[PDB]
């Protein structure tokens with residue numbers, strides 16, 4: 001949650017979480033603007049799920 | 050850091066990399082090695098307006114065209 005996937009390859013590197021989720025969308029073929037303009041929706045959907 | 054940069058009322062997002070600030074100026078870097086470059090219109094792409102991104106910051110994005118045309 002605080003370091004993403006960096007602590008498993010060396011030192012833990014902090015990065016804000018909203019920016020971690022944007023990287024993770026990029027890794028599946030979705031552009032990052034789709035998350036940042038819908039951040040509230042994805043957080044609501046995750047919390048209910 | 051900041052997710053996007055505002056210029057001319059438009060939101061700019063990095064193609065690859067993250068925005069960083071050294072204390073006084075902002076740069077674009079690649080994510081795996083610190084190597085800053087100036088934020089230009091060839092480094093970024095535009096999507097949406099600066100009203101939906103939380104944490105967007107003001108900066109200058111330089112266009113190479115105008116200083117070539119003096």
Ligand SMILES: *[C@@H]1O[C@H](CO)[C@@H](O[C@@H]2O[C@H](CO)[C@@H](O)[C@H](O)[C@H]2NC(C)=O)[C@H](O)[C@H]1NC(C)=O
Nearest residue numbers: 037038039040041042043044045046047048049
């Ligand atoms: C994408 O789908 C979601 C539902 O999966 C839509 O969000 C819902 O919208 C309805 C109608 O406004 C609301 O009553 C619900 O409360 C919303 N759900 C959540 C979890 O927020 C969303 O509007 C859709 N997006 C678009 C652009 O149509």
Ligand SMILES: *[C@@H]1O[C@H](CO)[C@@H](O[C@@H]2O[C@H](CO)[C@@H](O)[C@H](O)[C@H]2NC(C)=O)[C@H](O)[C@H]1NC(C)=O
Nearest residue numbers: 069070071072073074075076077084085086087
């Ligand atoms: C952040 O980096 C910049 C660029 O290196 C520093 O700003 C100065 O920028 C001018 C050009 O606009 C250069 O001619 C100077 O040599 C730069 N100074 C230095 C010390 O590099 C700026 O000082 C840096 N900020 C901090 C807080 O270190």
Ligand SMILES: *[C@@H]1O[C@H](CO)[C@@H](O[C@@H]2O[C@H](CO)[C@@H](O)[C@H](O)[C@H]2NC(C)=O)[C@H](O)[C@H]1NC(C)=O
Nearest residue numbers: 016017018019050051052053102103104105106
């Ligand atoms: C990050 O969190 C800090 C608090 O830990 C936020 O700082 C506050 O900002 C508000 C305005 O948004 C001020 O009214 C408060 O006085 C600030 N608090 C402190 C302790 O200085 C900061 O805004 C947050 N950053 C983002 C991008 O949301």
Ligand SMILES: *[C@@H]1O[C@H](CO)[C@@H](O[C@@H]2O[C@H](CO)[C@@H](O)[C@H](O)[C@H]2NC(C)=O)[C@H](O)[C@H]1NC(C)=O
Nearest residue numbers: 054055056057058059099104105106107108109
């Ligand atoms: C970033 O720059 C924009 C553009 O100058 C700022 O938008 C202005 O915001 C002020 C209030 O702070 C309004 O009075 C102006 O009408 C706005 N200008 C326009 C053209 O809409 C924005 O506030 C700046 N952001 C920060 C954090 O300073």
